[PDB]
Amino acid sequence: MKLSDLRPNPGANKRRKRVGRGPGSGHGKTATRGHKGQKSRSGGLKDPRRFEGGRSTTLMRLPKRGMQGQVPGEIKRPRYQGVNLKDLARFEGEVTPELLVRAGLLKKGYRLKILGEGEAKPLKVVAHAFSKSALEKLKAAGGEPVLLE
Amino acid sequence: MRVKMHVKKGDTVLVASGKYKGRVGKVKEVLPKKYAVIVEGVNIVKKAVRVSPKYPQGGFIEKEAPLHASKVRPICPACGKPTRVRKKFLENGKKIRVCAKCGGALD
Amino acid sequence: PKMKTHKGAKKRVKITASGKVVAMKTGKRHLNWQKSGKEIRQKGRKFVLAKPEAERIKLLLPYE
Amino acid sequence: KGLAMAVADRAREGKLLLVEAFAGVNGKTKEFLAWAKEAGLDGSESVLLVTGNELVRRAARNLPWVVTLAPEGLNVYDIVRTERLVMDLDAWEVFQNRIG
RNA sequence: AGAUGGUAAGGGCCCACGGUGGAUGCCUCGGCACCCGAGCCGAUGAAGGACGUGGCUACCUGCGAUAAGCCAGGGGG
RNA sequence: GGGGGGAACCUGGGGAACUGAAACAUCUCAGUACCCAGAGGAGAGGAAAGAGAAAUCGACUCCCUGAGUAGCGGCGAGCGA
RNA sequence: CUGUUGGGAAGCAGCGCCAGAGAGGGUGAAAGCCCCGUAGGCGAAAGGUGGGGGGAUAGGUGAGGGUACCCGAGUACCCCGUGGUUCGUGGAGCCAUGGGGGAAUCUGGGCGGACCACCGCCUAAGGCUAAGUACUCCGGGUGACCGAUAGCGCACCAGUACCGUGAGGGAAAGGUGAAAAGAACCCCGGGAGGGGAGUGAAAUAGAGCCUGAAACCGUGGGCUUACAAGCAGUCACGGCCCCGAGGGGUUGUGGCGUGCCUAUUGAAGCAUGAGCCGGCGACUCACGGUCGUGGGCGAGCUUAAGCCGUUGAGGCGGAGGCGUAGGGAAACCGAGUCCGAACAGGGCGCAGCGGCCGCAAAGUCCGCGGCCGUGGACCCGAAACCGGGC
RNA sequence: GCUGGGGCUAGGAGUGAAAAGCUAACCGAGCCCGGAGAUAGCUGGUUCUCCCCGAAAUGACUUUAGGGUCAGCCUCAGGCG
RNA sequence: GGAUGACCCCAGGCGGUAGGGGAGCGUUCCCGAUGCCGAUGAAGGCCGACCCGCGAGGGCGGCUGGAGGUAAGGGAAGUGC
RNA sequence: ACCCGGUGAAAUUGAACUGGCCGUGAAGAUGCGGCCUACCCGUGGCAGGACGAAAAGACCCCGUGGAGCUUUACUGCAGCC
Ligand SMILES: [Mg+2]
Ligand SMILES: [Mg+2]
Ligand SMILES: [Mg+2]
Ligand SMILES: [Mg+2]
Ligand SMILES: [Mg+2]
Ligand SMILES: [Mg+2]
Ligand SMILES: [Mg+2]
Ligand SMILES: [Mg+2]
Ligand SMILES: [Mg+2]
Ligand SMILES: [Mg+2]
Ligand SMILES: [Mg+2]
Ligand SMILES: [Mg+2]
Ligand SMILES: [Mg+2]
Ligand SMILES: [Mg+2]
Ligand SMILES: [Mg+2]
Ligand SMILES: [Mg+2]
Ligand SMILES: [Mg+2]
Ligand SMILES: [Mg+2]
Ligand SMILES: [Mg+2]
Ligand SMILES: [Mg+2]
Ligand SMILES: [Mg+2]
Ligand SMILES: [Mg+2]
Ligand SMILES: [Mg+2]
Ligand SMILES: [Mg+2]
Ligand SMILES: [Mg+2]
Ligand SMILES: [Mg+2]
Ligand SMILES: [Mg+2]
Ligand SMILES: [Mg+2]
Ligand SMILES: [Mg+2]
Ligand SMILES: [Mg+2]
Ligand SMILES: [Mg+2]
Ligand SMILES: [Mg+2]
Ligand SMILES: [Mg+2]
Ligand SMILES: [Mg+2]
Ligand SMILES: [Mg+2]
Ligand SMILES: [Mg+2]
Ligand SMILES: [Mg+2]
Ligand SMILES: [Mg+2]
Ligand SMILES: [Mg+2]
Ligand SMILES: [Mg+2]
Ligand SMILES: [Mg+2]
Ligand SMILES: [Mg+2]
Ligand SMILES: [Mg+2]
Ligand SMILES: [Mg+2]
Ligand SMILES: [Mg+2]
Ligand SMILES: [Mg+2]
Ligand SMILES: [Mg+2]
Ligand SMILES: [Mg+2]
Ligand SMILES: [Mg+2]
Ligand SMILES: [Mg+2]
Ligand SMILES: [Mg+2]
Ligand SMILES: [Mg+2]
Ligand SMILES: [Mg+2]
Ligand SMILES: [Mg+2]
Ligand SMILES: [Mg+2]
Ligand SMILES: [Mg+2]
Ligand SMILES: [Mg+2]
Ligand SMILES: [Mg+2]
Ligand SMILES: [Mg+2]
Ligand SMILES: [Mg+2]
Ligand SMILES: [Mg+2]
Ligand SMILES: [Mg+2]
Ligand SMILES: [Mg+2]
Ligand SMILES: [Mg+2]
Ligand SMILES: [Mg+2]
Ligand SMILES: [Mg+2]
Ligand SMILES: [Mg+2]
Ligand SMILES: [Mg+2]
Ligand SMILES: [Mg+2]
Ligand SMILES: [Mg+2]
Ligand SMILES: [Mg+2]
Ligand SMILES: [Mg+2]
Ligand SMILES: [Mg+2]
Ligand SMILES: [Mg+2]
Ligand SMILES: [Mg+2]
Ligand SMILES: [Mg+2]
Ligand SMILES: [Mg+2]
Ligand SMILES: [Mg+2]
Ligand SMILES: [Mg+2]
Ligand SMILES: [Mg+2]
Ligand SMILES: [Mg+2]
Ligand SMILES: [Mg+2]
Ligand SMILES: [Mg+2]
Ligand SMILES: [Mg+2]
Ligand SMILES: [Mg+2]
Ligand SMILES: [Mg+2]
Ligand SMILES: [Mg+2]
Ligand SMILES: [Mg+2]
Ligand SMILES: [Mg+2]
Ligand SMILES: [Mg+2]
Ligand SMILES: [Mg+2]
Ligand SMILES: [Mg+2]
Ligand SMILES: [Mg+2]
Ligand SMILES: [Mg+2]
Ligand SMILES: [Mg+2]
Ligand SMILES: [Mg+2]
Ligand SMILES: [Mg+2]
Ligand SMILES: [Mg+2]
Ligand SMILES: [Mg+2]
Ligand SMILES: [Mg+2]
Ligand SMILES: [Mg+2]
Ligand SMILES: [Mg+2]
Ligand SMILES: [Mg+2]
Ligand SMILES: [Mg+2]
Ligand SMILES: [Mg+2]
Ligand SMILES: [Mg+2]
Ligand SMILES: [Mg+2]
Ligand SMILES: [Mg+2]
Ligand SMILES: [Mg+2]
Ligand SMILES: [Mg+2]
Ligand SMILES: [Mg+2]
Ligand SMILES: [Mg+2]
Ligand SMILES: [Mg+2]
Ligand SMILES: [Mg+2]
Ligand SMILES: [Mg+2]
Ligand SMILES: [Mg+2]
Ligand SMILES: [Mg+2]
Ligand SMILES: [Mg+2]
Ligand SMILES: [Mg+2]
Ligand SMILES: [Mg+2]
Ligand SMILES: [Mg+2]
Ligand SMILES: [Mg+2]
Ligand SMILES: [Mg+2]
Ligand SMILES: [Mg+2]
Ligand SMILES: [Mg+2]
Ligand SMILES: [Mg+2]
Ligand SMILES: [Mg+2]
Ligand SMILES: [Mg+2]
Ligand SMILES: [Mg+2]
Ligand SMILES: [Mg+2]
Ligand SMILES: [Mg+2]
Ligand SMILES: [Mg+2]
Ligand SMILES: [Mg+2]
Ligand SMILES: [Mg+2]
Ligand SMILES: [Mg+2]
Ligand SMILES: [Mg+2]
Ligand SMILES: [Mg+2]
Ligand SMILES: [Mg+2]
Ligand SMILES: [Mg+2]
Ligand SMILES: [Mg+2]
Ligand SMILES: [Mg+2]
Ligand SMILES: [Mg+2]
Ligand SMILES: [Mg+2]
Ligand SMILES: [Mg+2]
Ligand SMILES: [Mg+2]
Ligand SMILES: [Mg+2]
Ligand SMILES: [Mg+2]
Ligand SMILES: [Mg+2]
Ligand SMILES: [Mg+2]
Ligand SMILES: [Mg+2]
Ligand SMILES: [Mg+2]
Ligand SMILES: [Mg+2]
Ligand SMILES: [Mg+2]
Ligand SMILES: [Mg+2]
Ligand SMILES: [Mg+2]
Ligand SMILES: [Mg+2]
Ligand SMILES: [Mg+2]
Ligand SMILES: [Mg+2]
Ligand SMILES: [Mg+2]
Ligand SMILES: [Mg+2]
Ligand SMILES: [Mg+2]
Ligand SMILES: [Mg+2]
Ligand SMILES: [Mg+2]
Ligand SMILES: [Mg+2]
Ligand SMILES: [Mg+2]
Ligand SMILES: [Mg+2]
Ligand SMILES: [Mg+2]
Ligand SMILES: [Mg+2]
Ligand SMILES: [Mg+2]
Ligand SMILES: [Mg+2]
Ligand SMILES: [Mg+2]
Ligand SMILES: [Mg+2]
Ligand SMILES: [Mg+2]
Ligand SMILES: [Mg+2]
Ligand SMILES: [Mg+2]
Ligand SMILES: [Mg+2]
Ligand SMILES: [Mg+2]
Ligand SMILES: [Mg+2]
Ligand SMILES: [Mg+2]
Ligand SMILES: [Mg+2]
Ligand SMILES: [Mg+2]
Ligand SMILES: [Mg+2]
Ligand SMILES: [Mg+2]
Ligand SMILES: [Mg+2]
Ligand SMILES: [Mg+2]
Ligand SMILES: [Mg+2]
Ligand SMILES: [Mg+2]
Ligand SMILES: [Mg+2]
Ligand SMILES: [Mg+2]
Ligand SMILES: [Mg+2]
Ligand SMILES: [Mg+2]
Ligand SMILES: [Mg+2]
Ligand SMILES: [Mg+2]
Ligand SMILES: [Mg+2]
Ligand SMILES: [Mg+2]
Ligand SMILES: [Mg+2]
Ligand SMILES: [Mg+2]
Ligand SMILES: [Mg+2]
Ligand SMILES: [Mg+2]
Ligand SMILES: [Mg+2]
Ligand SMILES: [Mg+2]
Ligand SMILES: [Mg+2]
Ligand SMILES: [Mg+2]
Ligand SMILES: [Mg+2]
Ligand SMILES: [Mg+2]
Ligand SMILES: [Mg+2]
Ligand SMILES: [Mg+2]
Ligand SMILES: [Mg+2]
Ligand SMILES: [Mg+2]
Ligand SMILES: [Mg+2]
Ligand SMILES: [Mg+2]
Ligand SMILES: [Mg+2]
Ligand SMILES: [Mg+2]
Ligand SMILES: [Mg+2]
Ligand SMILES: [Mg+2]
Ligand SMILES: [Mg+2]
Ligand SMILES: [Mg+2]
Ligand SMILES: [Mg+2]
Ligand SMILES: [Mg+2]
Ligand SMILES: [Mg+2]
Ligand SMILES: [Mg+2]
Ligand SMILES: [Mg+2]
Ligand SMILES: [Mg+2]
Ligand SMILES: [Mg+2]
Ligand SMILES: [Mg+2]
Ligand SMILES: [Mg+2]
Ligand SMILES: [Mg+2]
Ligand SMILES: [Mg+2]
Ligand SMILES: [Mg+2]
Ligand SMILES: [Mg+2]
Ligand SMILES: [Mg+2]
Ligand SMILES: [Mg+2]
Ligand SMILES: [Mg+2]
Ligand SMILES: [Mg+2]
Ligand SMILES: [Mg+2]
Ligand SMILES: [Mg+2]
Ligand SMILES: [Mg+2]
Ligand SMILES: [Mg+2]
Ligand SMILES: [Mg+2]
Ligand SMILES: [Mg+2]
Ligand SMILES: [Mg+2]
Ligand SMILES: [Mg+2]
Ligand SMILES: [Mg+2]
Ligand SMILES: [Mg+2]
Ligand SMILES: [Mg+2]
Ligand SMILES: [Mg+2]
Ligand SMILES: [Mg+2]
Ligand SMILES: [Mg+2]
Ligand SMILES: [Mg+2]
Ligand SMILES: [Mg+2]
Ligand SMILES: [Mg+2]
Ligand SMILES: [Mg+2]
Ligand SMILES: [Mg+2]
Ligand SMILES: [Mg+2]
Ligand SMILES: [Mg+2]
Ligand SMILES: [Mg+2]
Ligand SMILES: [Mg+2]
Ligand SMILES: [Zn+2]
């Protein structure tokens, strides 16, 4: 297999669209821009995600809701992430927050909360909280719930 | 700093390329700015001269045309072969050209 | 440069699990004395923004 | 995956050769050249010579049909560019460690 | 009676050759970008100039009435 | 000892407008352009009357990230630790 | 090295050789071995540097106990006016300070976002401090950078000519040939210019010089044209001329026939633009996003800066990011959750294929393409506004 | 009164027996360079070929009306059938 | 039909502005390339009533030119007036 | 002004092989229809036409364009109290 053989698969490298290059291309003259007006101009229109021609926008007519926060900003309080029993399936022996981080299950800087989707497995699971149904499934399967503080 | 010339006035050179390939001759002159040598009786050209005090009767003269120095090879005075040149340090220790075929000085 | 989150959108709207856009019913900020109870109550819920409008708002929230 | 597949491609063509060490090559092109001939490399086919032996690389590097590399340098363009792959065992060892 | 051809002052199309003009290709003394290196000069008068300076010298370079240069070390041949 | 010069770079003292906000004043552009002073091969900053929640860290500078987060905002356009 | 073609060998052919050097440039064409180089090595009396090595010097270093002397003042601190911070007066702290008032020395003071308490952090009102960082006038290396309308404004005697009182503006302009062998001498001519002669492989390579397009001007030839009506062509036939059951050129007659572009409801239009020709001339790039698509891995995917290596070699680096759970303004609960008295109702949510194997896939990374956001964002054009100068 | 020479006053400024006159051949705000590629919802221009499909000039709203947002109408890919 | 885009057969569609989509041509540059074409003549220019291609184009021939050019397959854009 | 010798511009210019009528046509036709008329090419003259040339209408309107000016428009600043 040699340099002359190396080919990208079909569709892997598509040509770009070139406008403003003659009549046969069917993108000549106006360059697919239509005729005249703001959108044909260099610079074009306002943020069409928001602006609506001068009338008050869809967005700005809906009510704000809830606590938006104040200076000096977010209040530091402990944060919990749940991981379900089913995600604990893969482990044997002990699970702790740290292992769960490594598995790519628990994100750093969150506390562990175990949740109920799935089946419990007789493991020693150490966490900051358990849901009602998690505790239940866990006790019943002869696993061992351990609270951290 | 200086142009490198592997050949000089008037060691004996073989003309190794061009119309005169094969000829042997003394280097009458070295022109480093043009990187060229004049070899005796090699590269003759017919130049027109005006009827002048220097040349009354006018007509033409023969002149030696310069050769690009790379066309030329010194002939070793010991072995008589055309050669590349090497440098050898003496005891002085001045340095000198020596033939690359045998070890002979080229001056 | 990276896109900026539109703060009026972040403050008015939420993108649901399946990407619908949700906002509070408009119309009971005030002038409510003569509104029926069916009215005030119904305006107290969230509704799901019309597709083309939600689709626009969704693009202003590039990192939710 | 690419590194592996490229070597694999040569392996599948018989064009990959592993070697224990290099006889008399002690940094001279004629020395490598000897050895090479003796090992079935007449220079009619381009060779990616991979070895950690500096002495062997210098010896082979001036040959127009030889491209040389340390084993840490092995890469797919070089494998694919050349017709034949030649490795030290020690070279081959790191490549195995690299594709692991 | 009838009927039809040779006129070219000049013009038009085509072909050949030229003139004009300086495209195109090739070229590169120059430019550009990045990376590395290096980074202050000046009253001991800088930067930057003026005028000079060659046997003959318009200009450029170099140089300063010791004026394309003076002395000394090193390099080179 | 100073004075004057130096392409960018740097600090400090001053400091716009077009423009954007589909008009405009707050806001933006922007502490940008520009003027001035000063340095120097860099300049600035620097050895906690710090950070800010950890029973923690440990001068300053510079890069990645944190994060378009927190927030700020005719809660508009936008701005942004 | 030799032979050969050739003006010229480095081409082709024969037989060799070097290589830690087959980077590259030259040489009359295309050269590893002819030249300059290249790999690998070597080199400073003098000046400069010297963050590395060595040495010196300055400087550095105790423990209880007592005393309560000192510990940076128009300062802290409070109020007023402001600036800085993400903070636009906000619940507005902090840092800074123009005005007023105005302390204390560790049992002192500042701070942890008004304030108070508690619990902590830190020691203001004196100074210095390498390095890691920015830049590129200068030197060098290197380009999926330009190649004379490009690339710097300038390849060239250019910040010049020229323009402007001035600040300031600001060009054009490269190429004989391998070598000048740059055309002695004769002829016509006042000269310019040419014609011979000569040089050269070549002279429509002759210096007004490589190539030498097009518009434009001419000479010569073929066909045609002075009763004809025209977007200039087209279709047909016939004549003549040319190259040789065919073609080509030309055009007499007959048929048909309203330029191009632009903008418009609508143009041949008496609506725009264009004298003709050559060259320059307008949908891109970064970073984010969204979909689509080619692959990699898949409950996971992926690294950034940096570090090591290379000198067109890759690797390391898991900090971080996205995903794996949602609902709720939030506390918070969680395959649920929110409203609610509700075990009500509702909103928003939750649930592969084949034979343990393979296959597919959430997702995510990279490439490619479309479109979006931010930038001047497809190119060209104002009238104006502002700064500093003249 | 006219005039030579030497001087001073300038850009929101001068100067003006007043005309918005004149301030270096266009002054209801001089010229140069800079912000700067200001902005231009306007006008103009937008470059190779073939093939398939193929609109709109409406409705709502709009300091909107020769500009937009959504919808209608065109096209592509996937699914349904 | 054959198995697959080999090509044959039958049928049907194929006016087109804005505009969507598809497939191609050509220009500069990179890998391919220490290769290959090249003074028995590179590029470029001027002819051509010939060959291939729907076309954009690509060949081949003659003349000019006098030293460069560059494939199959890929890659990237200062790419077509 | 005209003729002969000398020197020798300009705007403008899609190309032109550039007649009249009555009609037709985006509504004022050398260029379309039907007719009429008309051999080729100039020189001096005239100005009816080529909606002749020049100048991207200065009037008018449009642009959420500009600028000068005004005031018991709004908001600020100098200045003064
Ligand atoms: Mg691409
Ligand atoms: Mg086209
Ligand atoms: Mg298309
Ligand atoms: Mg179209
Ligand atoms: Mg067009
Ligand atoms: Mg347009
Ligand atoms: Mg379009
Ligand atoms: Mg478009
Ligand atoms: Mg348009
Ligand atoms: Mg339209
Ligand atoms: Mg247009
Ligand atoms: Mg318009
Ligand atoms: Mg439009
Ligand atoms: Mg436009
Ligand atoms: Mg613009
Ligand atoms: Mg615009
Ligand atoms: Mg309104
Ligand atoms: Mg928040
Ligand atoms: Mg147990
Ligand atoms: Mg020497
Ligand atoms: Mg001989
Ligand atoms: Mg010596
Ligand atoms: Mg309400
Ligand atoms: Mg309200
Ligand atoms: Mg309320
Ligand atoms: Mg209220
Ligand atoms: Mg009622
Ligand atoms: Mg009502
Ligand atoms: Mg009621
Ligand atoms: Mg995030
Ligand atoms: Mg989410
Ligand atoms: Mg090699
Ligand atoms: Mg190779
Ligand atoms: Mg007759
Ligand atoms: Mg005739
Ligand atoms: Mg005649
Ligand atoms: Mg004719
Ligand atoms: Mg000619
Ligand atoms: Mg080239
Ligand atoms: Mg310097
Ligand atoms: Mg000087
Ligand atoms: Mg001089
Ligand atoms: Mg000396
Ligand atoms: Mg000496
Ligand atoms: Mg000073
Ligand atoms: Mg100084
Ligand atoms: Mg400042
Ligand atoms: Mg100061
Ligand atoms: Mg300031
Ligand atoms: Mg400043
Ligand atoms: Mg000011
Ligand atoms: Mg403003
Ligand atoms: Mg702007
Ligand atoms: Mg904007
Ligand atoms: Mg505005
Ligand atoms: Mg606007
Ligand atoms: Mg206005
Ligand atoms: Mg404004
Ligand atoms: Mg802006
Ligand atoms: Mg600001
Ligand atoms: Mg600047
Ligand atoms: Mg200074
Ligand atoms: Mg430094
Ligand atoms: Mg420093
Ligand atoms: Mg310092
Ligand atoms: Mg201290
Ligand atoms: Mg984050
Ligand atoms: Mg808001
Ligand atoms: Mg700011
Ligand atoms: Mg011969
Ligand atoms: Mg030979
Ligand atoms: Mg040979
Ligand atoms: Mg090398
Ligand atoms: Mg080479
Ligand atoms: Mg070479
Ligand atoms: Mg030659
Ligand atoms: Mg060769
Ligand atoms: Mg070559
Ligand atoms: Mg060579
Ligand atoms: Mg070396
Ligand atoms: Mg060396
Ligand atoms: Mg003590
Ligand atoms: Mg005391
Ligand atoms: Mg103190
Ligand atoms: Mg004091
Ligand atoms: Mg204060
Ligand atoms: Mg502030
Ligand atoms: Mg507030
Ligand atoms: Mg505050
Ligand atoms: Mg104070
Ligand atoms: Mg205390
Ligand atoms: Mg106290
Ligand atoms: Mg304080
Ligand atoms: Mg305080
Ligand atoms: Mg406090
Ligand atoms: Mg604190
Ligand atoms: Mg503290
Ligand atoms: Mg300091
Ligand atoms: Mg240090
Ligand atoms: Mg530093
Ligand atoms: Mg640097
Ligand atoms: Mg440089
Ligand atoms: Mg080149
Ligand atoms: Mg030129
Ligand atoms: Mg130029
Ligand atoms: Mg040229
Ligand atoms: Mg220059
Ligand atoms: Mg020039
Ligand atoms: Mg000049
Ligand atoms: Mg002037
Ligand atoms: Mg002048
Ligand atoms: Mg100017
Ligand atoms: Mg010019
Ligand atoms: Mg030459
Ligand atoms: Mg020459
Ligand atoms: Mg004569
Ligand atoms: Mg005479
Ligand atoms: Mg003569
Ligand atoms: Mg003659
Ligand atoms: Mg002659
Ligand atoms: Mg001859
Ligand atoms: Mg020949
Ligand atoms: Mg010729
Ligand atoms: Mg020639
Ligand atoms: Mg010429
Ligand atoms: Mg030549
Ligand atoms: Mg010529
Ligand atoms: Mg010519
Ligand atoms: Mg011609
Ligand atoms: Mg004729
Ligand atoms: Mg008649
Ligand atoms: Mg007749
Ligand atoms: Mg006809
Ligand atoms: Mg017929
Ligand atoms: Mg015929
Ligand atoms: Mg015929
Ligand atoms: Mg015909
Ligand atoms: Mg008939
Ligand atoms: Mg017509
Ligand atoms: Mg018609
Ligand atoms: Mg056309
Ligand atoms: Mg037009
Ligand atoms: Mg129009
Ligand atoms: Mg109109
Ligand atoms: Mg109209
Ligand atoms: Mg017409
Ligand atoms: Mg008409
Ligand atoms: Mg007309
Ligand atoms: Mg008109
Ligand atoms: Mg017209
Ligand atoms: Mg118009
Ligand atoms: Mg013109
Ligand atoms: Mg013409
Ligand atoms: Mg053209
Ligand atoms: Mg685009
Ligand atoms: Mg994309
Ligand atoms: Mg993707
Ligand atoms: Mg992968
Ligand atoms: Mg998979
Ligand atoms: Mg992210
Ligand atoms: Mg429910
Ligand atoms: Mg439900
Ligand atoms: Mg995937
Ligand atoms: Mg889009
Ligand atoms: Mg921009
Ligand atoms: Mg742009
Ligand atoms: Mg764009
Ligand atoms: Mg502009
Ligand atoms: Mg003005
Ligand atoms: Mg104004
Ligand atoms: Mg103003
Ligand atoms: Mg000004
Ligand atoms: Mg001023
Ligand atoms: Mg006077
Ligand atoms: Mg005077
Ligand atoms: Mg006077
Ligand atoms: Mg005055
Ligand atoms: Mg004045
Ligand atoms: Mg002034
Ligand atoms: Mg003014
Ligand atoms: Mg005023
Ligand atoms: Mg003004
Ligand atoms: Mg005034
Ligand atoms: Mg007066
Ligand atoms: Mg008046
Ligand atoms: Mg002036
Ligand atoms: Mg005037
Ligand atoms: Mg004004
Ligand atoms: Mg004036
Ligand atoms: Mg300036
Ligand atoms: Mg700006
Ligand atoms: Mg701009
Ligand atoms: Mg504006
Ligand atoms: Mg375009
Ligand atoms: Mg159709
Ligand atoms: Mg309408
Ligand atoms: Mg409508
Ligand atoms: Mg309504
Ligand atoms: Mg509406
Ligand atoms: Mg329109
Ligand atoms: Mg409009
Ligand atoms: Mg739409
Ligand atoms: Mg439909
Ligand atoms: Mg479909
Ligand atoms: Mg058919
Ligand atoms: Mg079809
Ligand atoms: Mg049909
Ligand atoms: Mg069609
Ligand atoms: Mg298609
Ligand atoms: Mg396509
Ligand atoms: Mg092709
Ligand atoms: Mg092309
Ligand atoms: Mg292509
Ligand atoms: Mg390149
Ligand atoms: Mg190569
Ligand atoms: Mg080559
Ligand atoms: Mg050959
Ligand atoms: Mg030849
Ligand atoms: Mg030939
Ligand atoms: Mg080329
Ligand atoms: Mg070519
Ligand atoms: Mg052709
Ligand atoms: Mg040719
Ligand atoms: Mg060459
Ligand atoms: Mg190529
Ligand atoms: Mg290729
Ligand atoms: Mg490739
Ligand atoms: Mg372009
Ligand atoms: Mg007469
Ligand atoms: Mg006359
Ligand atoms: Mg005509
Ligand atoms: Mg006529
Ligand atoms: Mg009518
Ligand atoms: Mg009529
Ligand atoms: Mg007529
Ligand atoms: Mg007609
Ligand atoms: Mg008629
Ligand atoms: Mg007629
Ligand atoms: Mg008539
Ligand atoms: Mg006349
Ligand atoms: Mg008339
Ligand atoms: Mg008249
Ligand atoms: Mg007419
Ligand atoms: Mg008229
Ligand atoms: Mg007119
Ligand atoms: Mg006109
Ligand atoms: Mg205009
Ligand atoms: Mg107009
Ligand atoms: Mg107008
Ligand atoms: Mg008016
Ligand atoms: Mg009007
Ligand atoms: Mg108006
Ligand atoms: Mg308005
Ligand atoms: Mg408007
Ligand atoms: Mg206005
Ligand atoms: Mg105004
Ligand atoms: Mg007063
Ligand atoms: Zn010898």
User: For the packed helices D2-12 and D89-98, what is the interaxial angle rounded to 10 degrees?
Assistant: 140
Q: Does A2 touch chain D (CB under 8 A)?
A: yes
Method used experimentally: X-ray
Q: What's the Å distance between residue C32 CA and nucleotide F34 C1'?
A: 57
Cα distance between residue A131 and residue C51, in whole Å: 36
Identify whether the C-beta of residue B15 lies closer than 8 Å to the C-beta of residue B21.
yes
CB-based contact, A7 to chain D, within 8 Å: no
Cβ pairs A/C, distance under 8 A: 38
DSSP state of A43: T
- Pairwise CA distance, residues D50 & D68, whole Å: 6
Angle between helix D54-61 and D29-38 (nearest 10): 90
Pairwise CB contact (< 8 Å): A6 & D81: no
Model resolution, angstroms = 2.9
Sheet harboring A144-147: ordered strands across? A94-95, A124-127, A144-147
The two three-digit tokens of residue D60, written as one number: 């082979």
Cα D96 to Cα A86, B106, C42, D4, D13: the distances in Å are: 37, 59, 68, 9, 19
| A124, B67, C49 from A110: Cα distances, Å | 20, 85, 33
Q: Kindly list the residues from chain A whose CB atom is less than 8 angstroms away from the CB atom of residue C43.
A: none
| Cα(A2)–Cα(D36) distance, integer angstroms | 23
In a mutagenesis test of the A interface, which of C3, C4, C6, C12 is the best target, namely the one with the most A β-carbons within 10 Å?
Answer: C12
**Residue B97: which nucleotide is closest by CA–C1'?**
E77
